[model samples]
Target chain A: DHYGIHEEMLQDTVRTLSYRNAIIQNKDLFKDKIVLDVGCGTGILSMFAAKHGAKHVIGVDMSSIIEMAKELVELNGFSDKITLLRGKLEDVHLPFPKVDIIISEWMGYFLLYESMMDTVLYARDHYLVEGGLIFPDKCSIHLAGLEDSQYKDEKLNYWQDVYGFDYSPFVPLVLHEPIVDTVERNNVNTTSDKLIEFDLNTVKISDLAFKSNFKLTAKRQDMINGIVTWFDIVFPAPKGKRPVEFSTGPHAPYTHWKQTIFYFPDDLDAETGDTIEGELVCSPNEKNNRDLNIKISYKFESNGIDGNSRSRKNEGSYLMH
Target chain B: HYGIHEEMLQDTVRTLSYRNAIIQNKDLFKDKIVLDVGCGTGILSMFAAKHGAKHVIGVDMSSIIEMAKELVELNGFSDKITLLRGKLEDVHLPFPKVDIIISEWMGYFLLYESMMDTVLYARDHYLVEGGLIFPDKCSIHLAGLEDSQYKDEKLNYWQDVYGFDYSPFVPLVLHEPIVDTVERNNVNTTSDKLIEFDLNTVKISDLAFKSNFKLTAKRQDMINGIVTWFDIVFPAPKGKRPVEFSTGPHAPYTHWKQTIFYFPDDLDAETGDTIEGELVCSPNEKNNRDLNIKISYKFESNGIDGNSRSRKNEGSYLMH
Candidate 1:
């Protein structure tokens, strides 16, 4: 809805630039090719395609922005080669019988949160020609243990005494919602491990609903107060140029996607040799397909020394909308 | 709406402002009865309870009240604070009258999406004689901006986006005032007050209005847009002064930044030139929650208007 999505999308340079770079860098692939831009907000991607030698480009979006996109297409003098469609791909017919390339920026929070991959897949099944390329052919979600002392104190502890008032009751609600912000590299206490990966060219919509187990080794003797999740997007190389990619991880340059942190109620202490193990399950919520229901269970040995150790376990289910 | 609320709450300056204003003025609130309109998260009610209020009633028309109730109980103020989850006009209160009414209801553009009407209803129905309103008064101000480059980038450049034509979107975007940070250095004209309202006395029906303003150019330049924002004031104590804060470009930045209306065409004028305009604002008939705004203006090269070189412009905006 306009209330939530438009404001964020317009201001997020990381999202806008990534799509711009991918489309502009590969002029040879787009030369005289028929292109389909799914969820074409403001028709920016369609503009990029037309600029890069696309013979014909069709941009489709169901939101009110599509009406504006129609205007932008005419203003840019691309009305002859570009078409703007204002309905769902499943319901609307494309001007072109088949597209040679499918370009879409569908990744959302935690990779799958609010993602438009299903729509892109639908377009691939119904519209894309054989061997047609999908932008950013691969994506991977990664997770790491975080030592978030400062933010945890700010978001949770501050509620305990708000101007000499007991506001501890609000702590649980704050904890339930994951904080979407940048995490410092020094706060990351464990080596990250891949949670899931998708090959967009072949992955099915059903494959996105997944459950996986991961193990990460502690990089130092530190307290783990939370877990952080991020994603990496890679565009395959064209005929001559090397592959282009970017990460939303802690070490990467700042991006609006940032990282999602889930703080634990109790901190877990680990030695350099300790291993943190967890299982993550993701599925579309029954009530809202756009929302993701995630469950995480983690356990690690505490105070382990000279072959003796104590174990602590914690688990929680979260809804990311 | 939840996302916007989270962002507003994360803005420490805004939350701390209301907190300091309440806690520092405990003399007026201690052992007194209070009413909190649009009490999201029950924060202000808890502040009153902590400051030794006899009792506090919180009213809101959002599902967020459920969470607020849980928070109230958790904070051990369930007995001292009561929450009502319906429109202020529809809900009955435990107290017939209250000693003070507090609310943090300001929205973008100062008036858009604001809950001032509900606060006015509470004042008329429940507030005692001489009772206080948290923000006693507010003033809306306007200035002209000279940044033609940025204006074109936002409005006209879309027409040639990445070498493609996209001009149709410009009109819709122009109709919606953009909420963004505007540097003080960009202001090209002296500010003019569009409205000055007193919360304690103004009637809700008097909010929709049409006003004329004239702004003088401080220097010779091309004006591409009109910038608007507001300032609020808290009542003063005996022999003291009222506390005030502004969201203007010249003041400290806040979550509710300045709203801008870009002119369709540039206007060239000289120093001391006068720009006269009329503004009309009212609630939309189909959706009362939204605001309909319109502006018409003309500029003169010199102080006089009859025959000097002049330019005219107009724009409409919808704040949802």
Candidate 2:
């Protein structure tokens, strides 16, 4: 629960910044209009919208989050102009007559750790008045293969070759089995898969499904060692700015969810700029849980570009809410 | 200097690299060409040859290291081992490629002031397919010992905190440098006595130098943080065999100095195990002075495992 709270705060900030940057990037939108921040954790986004010259600002979230958010609003002295509510958006209990702009940070790890985005979609479909605009116009997932030595080192731990002792036979029993279990328990999935680019801006939450093609190199011969995946979402904000890129790395503030690296068997290797192919399935289910199932079938190629040189295929998956 | 050399010898003899290389007998140089960068005394090169390396070349910058070549000749391994009187990075090899690389290049502070790049460049150039650098990995550890001297340093530091005219504390700083060196040197010597260390037949040596650290702030304040650093190096072996380090509890500890930062500003408000920082050592120069270093974190105290919390500063070195 503590981790969940931490993630909520972090994602709230990311989505806020994402929306602001999106609006600023597209100067044509967000000109002195009313804006609403859905599930605004701290009312910080509402404050930003007001600062960006929005004629009116409203924020909403479930439970005591709104209480704390109201306190923040009062502390920031935006209580008079901005209104925050504590309620679910599906019931339409908001006091606001209508919202001209609606934005939310309802993404999770792999874009489905939490299914809050569906709430945003529901609110958008039912609550937006005529001539209304959604802050996030589009969202997508772009994934590529990464070359990492640490992944290879982890693979090396499964191998045994000290002196002339042919202790290779013990690897499967003493090393590989435990390592595989440990990896699975640790949730370190490195099986090859395709990048499922998800566009949140255009697709309705109900139509949030992904199908991807993973072009990957199987035998990493100086090949990519890791997959660095990130999302780009464009939303409306102040003046003309650029789309925000919320990424995960050493620099990305401490979120429990760091980038994941999938290791290959010691026998196989990968290089930089290699090609990989795979598939993905995304669906929002009950219990506020978004189900995402992935299957990646990849082949070794040069930079995923079309070429004559071809190789074998490797596969893997990731399932989440 | 005399005592320092003795301490260095003791540390080296107790190193995991020395112990594991012998006991594990990893055949990195087996049936392959081997290169020993920074081949200090050529003992490792001799060991490589003894391990069935088809050919072995040893390189070092120190002219006095010729004694190692003499030792090889004396040991009747002169033909199997070749000693070169040149810098490892600058040395010219007659062979086209080497299968394995082995060297002992760790220094004080781990990477502080050593010839590791010479080995790295050699790896990029001479190593054959799948060749590895010896001492595949290394890390640094830190802890505060219960010492009046350390306490006094902190006291004097705080006296100047509020600009309270604490110039009288200058003597503490002046006296500390000398006393600290003496204390640290003696501590190093006494540390050997603290544990009956064996370079061979020991697994704890491999882990003695590394530990997970979490900071628990005793005071409600902004802690700049502490910096603890160390170094390690990997060498090249001949032929096509993989490279490895004779690391672990049993290897010798080099004289590479340990790094310490009493307080830093960047890690302000860090307390408990909220931070997880680690430095991953490699053969690069930027991260290391002579070797590679990666300062991965600045953190606070978390509960420790085994005797890490109870043993204080010297806890890591005390292995079973």
Candidate 3:
């Protein structure tokens, strides 16, 4: 149980290597610069910065893994180069008055669910120097249509029949449970252009919680059972080189990052070019700030190709983990 | 989360097998008295009634029996099916004995949290001579799997937690069996039926079992783990055929996906090399419902892949 989550993140090459390439490859930015790492479990990114030319790296985390991180830094001979701070960035004392750059992997599923962007913003204001950089300077959250009736029906209408009994009464129990699984790229019924992109340099913590409306046109004629969401984190590169970015969407390799999906009690029939418009309201859970409460109210209009034209609307709630 | 009833009910491969096994064996149920043991939802009781049973008595200790009673009434079996909300041994049935005992008593690993003892008790005390059990026979099988990726993700990843000696975590991972689905292609060796059970005759002592097996590698691969699945065979009556279903990887998926027991160390296997193992199953000391499994195995590469390697190890696992 202790190593359950850290193992997932470390084994996820897509996630770890992305952070690795961003910190290690940018020698000019890291060289002779004081760096700060937030929630640096096991001090991996801090080690990366120290392995590069960083003047000194300070890794901060409130988790007990910070003790092991201190040991790891010493094992790797980065005890002097990397400073291990075992407390919140807001209250933890840093030897340096200000840091030249901040490196953090703070994004979560649905972009905001369980994210530490608020802490990053605090580090940005309290610790970062003028014109300093964040390793992953941008992240974008997007919504798209998914057509997966096979899985949807299996979980949604499962109570409708229990060895030929009338179990329809228990049908609502499964509707609001968000399915956290990888959707095949083929199941993405709509294109995933960015719904909102946050620039870490200037985006406020308030911007993290928002009610946004999106319109997605179906890419094909199929049944739309749910709305799926994934985020793309970006590390900007100098003009000549390509930017370092990876999508958590269906089109990319799985990063152990779950793309949260919201399924209605019933599905909607969609024709090619049919429009699905929705308002997604996401915010931190009041009781548990690390979790999120999200609700999507959506409407779908059929194009009436080969059949009848009509409109239907539905809403589903999820406590995104 | 939904009710465990719906979870099992939605598994078509599981519930349907029981239905087809009971309904298709209609001759066994016609004009016969049926006993539904641990009938959580009275689904099986109604099935026997609908399949032409003269009388059905369903028993459960859980409050779900009250709901199952309402369900049975709604299904128009008020007279044919009677639901009793109590332990089977504590209650007396209207009939002295039943001709068929139709039960859905399977659990994870086929025995953990099992009502196998109760059914055996029913056979001994309640069933008429030569009476039938819905799933009269079952088998558990084991095969070597090439699961380097997931195995590493689950256990080997601990080798370096960003530079720490967490290999101690490996033993913890080894001791707890993983309940998950194994890819059919991941199994690189032929399976050996480790153990089989005939419910009609198996006694309480037989539930704690030990069996030996030898699995031959079909190709060169790393044997990272051993996967276990069971097959339920409903033996038919005279002049009839048996109905069968499996939770094996080769068969349709069942809620009891497959129990995977990973070896603490990877065994490099080559084509034709043999993996010989002995598995032991027993109830935990603290909890009878929990299963404590032990496996000891050996393999010899035999230079078949231009290398000579032979090794063996033993592991203690809990399937609680």
- Candidate maximizing TM-score: 1
Model 2 C-alpha lDDT per residue in residues A1-321, reported as the tens digit of each score:
134774556565554566566655543455567777777776766877765666677787876667777877788867777888777867747776678887776765555445477777777766687557666655555554455555555555544543334566654333222111111212212334335444544456555655565544443344443454444444544444444555433224434334443332322243334445554444544654545544444555444534434334555554442
TM-score of each: 0.81, 0.44, 0.63
Candidate 1 at residue A154, lDDT?
A: 81
Model 3 chain B, poorest ten-residue lDDT window?
B160-169
Error of 2 at B258 (Å): 14
* Interface quality of candidate 1 as DockQ: 0.36
By lDDT rank, best first, the candidates go 3, 1, 2
In angstroms, the error of model 1 at B288 is 3.7
- The predicted structure with the larger DockQ, 1 or 3, is 1
Model 2, range B239-296, lDDT digits (tens) per residue? 4342233222223333443343332122333123234444333333343233333333
> What lDDT would candidate 1 get against the real structure?
0.81
| Number of the top DockQ candidate | 1
List runs of model 2 lying over 4 Å from the truth: A1-32, A147-201, A216-226, A237-257, A260-267, A271-274, A283-288, A301-311, B1-320
Scored against the true structure, residue A33 in model 3 reaches a CA lDDT of: 94
Write down the DockQ of candidate 3: 0.16
